[PDB]
Amino acid sequence: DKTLRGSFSSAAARDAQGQSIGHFEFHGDHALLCVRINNVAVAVGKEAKLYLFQAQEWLKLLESSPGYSCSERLARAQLTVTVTQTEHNLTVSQTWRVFYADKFTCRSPQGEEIPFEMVLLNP
Ligand SMILES: *[C@@H]1O[C@H](CO)[C@@H](O)[C@H](O)[C@H]1NC(C)=O
């Protein structure tokens, strides 16, 4: 299992073409990633989204020449969630890597960062 607290940042996401939140590995066919936020209106206003990549697929994208554009690489995520509620549970079926992006990432006042808590459960 894993627990992480932090904040989703438009600046961090724009800087790296997706803000890297974390990574995880698990044994078995399914795991549950639970994401909690309080500021839903700010997330909806930014079109906040999470992108999950299988780290082997993500590495293949980064090793491609010339390389994918910001939007094309995020469109190749294995799983996504559009952040519209205080909690979203993602069933991850099969290392995995999690990224945050919003309407400013692949392009206006960018507002403030969105605090979050993420819990990963392996069953
Ligand atoms: C996420 O999973 C937890 C644990 O089963 C549950 O308590 C919670 O209600 C779920 N939330 C949503 C939005 O499905």
Task: Fill in the keyword field for this structure.
monomer; about 120 residues; alpha+beta; Jelly Rolls; four-stranded antiparallel β-sheet; 4 helices; about 40% strand; flat; binds 2-acetamido-2-deoxy-beta-D-glucopyranose; unknown function; gold
**Helical content class:** 10-25%
Shape: flat
Taking the sheet with the most strands, its summary is: 4 strands, antiparallel
CA distance, first residue to last residue: 9 Å
Per DSSP, the total helix count is 4
Structural classification = alpha+beta
Question: Spatial order of the strands in the main sheet?
Answer: 1-8-3-6
Order of helices and strands: EHEEHEHHEEEE
* CATH topology call: Jelly Rolls
Strand content: 35-45%
List of distinct ligands in this structure: 2-acetamido-2-deoxy-beta-D-glucopyranose
Which CATH class? Mainly Beta
Number of domains: 1
User: If classified by CATH, what would the architecture be?
Assistant: Sandwich
Radius of gyration: 14 Å
Number of strands: 8
Structure overview:
The protein is an alpha+beta fold. It has a single domain, classed as Jelly Rolls, CATH 2.60.120.380. It has helices spanning 10-16, 40-46, 55-63, 70-74, and strands at 2-8, 19-24, 30-37, 49-54, 79-82, 87-93, 96-101, 114-121. The longest helix is centred in the middle third of the chain and has 9 residues, at 55-63. It binds 2-acetamido-2-deoxy-beta-D-glucopyranose (NAG). 2-acetamido-2-deoxy-beta-D-glucopyranose binds next to strand 6. The PDB classes it as unknown function.
